[PDB]
Chains A and B, each alone.
Chain A
Amino acid sequence: EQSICQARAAVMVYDDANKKWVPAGGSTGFSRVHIYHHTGNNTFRVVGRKIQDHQVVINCAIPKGLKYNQATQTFHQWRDARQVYGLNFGSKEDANVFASAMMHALEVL
């Protein structure tokens, strides 16, 4: 697996029952978020680890056809059949880097 981008963001998941965003892994703070490319079968995954204690807070597949919503210039989100994910980026540059890699992955899938 090869990393195609690194971006700083607070990883959130939506708690629909309470209509509230909550920190991924239950750990508030920023993470280093990668998109990893597995060339063997041309698959991509979003993997993020807390800057402080290195806990993996997100490890989710990027499926072909995903709708990646750039809600704001610093908060992007997407959903799968089970959860809604949100990335509150530390800067617009981080958001642009990550969106570029995401949009690339969705183009080559």
Chain B
Amino acid sequence: XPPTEDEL
């Protein structure tokens, strides 16, 4: 299962 503000 994968683990940001950059993505949000």
Task: Give A residues with C-beta under 8 Å from B.
Answer: 10, 12, 14, 19-22, 28, 69, 71, 77, 79, 84, 86, 88
Taking the closest CB of chain A, its distance from the CB of B1, in whole angstroms, is: 5
B7 near A84: Cβ-Cβ < 8 Å:
no
A84 vs B1: C-alpha distance when bound (angstroms): 8
Q: Is the interface of A mostly helix, strand, loop or mixed?
A: strand
Q: How large is the interface on B (under 10, 10 to 19, 20 to 34, 35 or more residues)?
A: under 10
A86 vs B4: C-alpha distance when bound (angstroms): 12
| Residues 1-8 of B at the A interface (beta carbon under 8 Å) | 1-4, 7-8
Chain B: CB-nearest residue to A21 = B7
> Given the complex, which residues of A lie within 8 Å of B3, measured CB to CB?
71
